[PDB]
Amino acid sequence: SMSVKKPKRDDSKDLALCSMILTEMETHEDAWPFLLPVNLKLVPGYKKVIKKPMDFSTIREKLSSGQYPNLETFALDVRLVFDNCETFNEDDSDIGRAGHNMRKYFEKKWTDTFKV
Ligand SMILES: Cc1ncccc1N[C@H](C)CS(C)(=O)=O
């Protein structure tokens, strides 16, 4: 509360670490469904069904222009990618399993990197 400060972690390296994590995501062989925005004119239903589309290139732009206030908002967008993927694709479709794989890959890196 007012004049009662909680010890807070060093966040000075968060931007650089989030960037390195995103790069590893981008270079994963199963990253191909998530590199660019889903083409709304090509995929029937996506615009109507998915209220908040997200992809790695959009995350990369937001990260590169100071649109993430903190690392938690960054993880929210990353998880949004895979949440959207689960909504629209069957679990054992090529795109569907890519999403499950990529989510698992992200969460371990997240823990290994920040949750010390
Ligand atoms: C991730 C996702 N989710 C739902 C449908 C498609 C996709 N990914 C596609 C590769 C994008 S497209 C078909 O090139 O426009």
UniProtKB/Swiss-Prot annotation:
It comes from the Eukaryota. It is found in: Nucleus. Expressed at varying levels in several tissues, whereas a smaller transcript was expressed specifically in testis. Residues 9-113 form the Bromo domain. Belongs to the WAL family. Component of the BRF-1 ISWI chromatin remodeling complex, at least composed of SMARCA1 and BAZ2B, which regulates the spacing of histone octamers on the DNA template to facilitate access to DNA. Within the BRF-1 ISWI chromatin remodeling complex interacts with SMARCA1; the interaction is direct. Component of the BRF-5 ISWI chromatin remodeling complex, at least composed of SMARCA5/SNF2H and BAZ2B, which regulates the spacing of histone octamers on the DNA template to facilitate access to DNA. Regulatory subunit of the ATP-dependent BRF-1 and BRF-5 ISWI chromatin remodeling complexes, which form ordered nucleosome arrays on chromatin and facilitate access to DNA during DNA-templated processes such as DNA replication, transcription, and repair. Both complexes regulate the spacing of nucleosomes along the chromatin and have the ability to slide mononucleosomes to the center of a DNA template. The BRF-1 ISWI chromatin remodeling complex has a lower ATP hydrolysis rate than the BRF-5 ISWI chromatin remodeling complex. This is Bromodomain adjacent to zinc finger domain protein 2B. The gene is BAZ2B. The chain holds residues 2054 to 2167 of 2168 of the full protein.
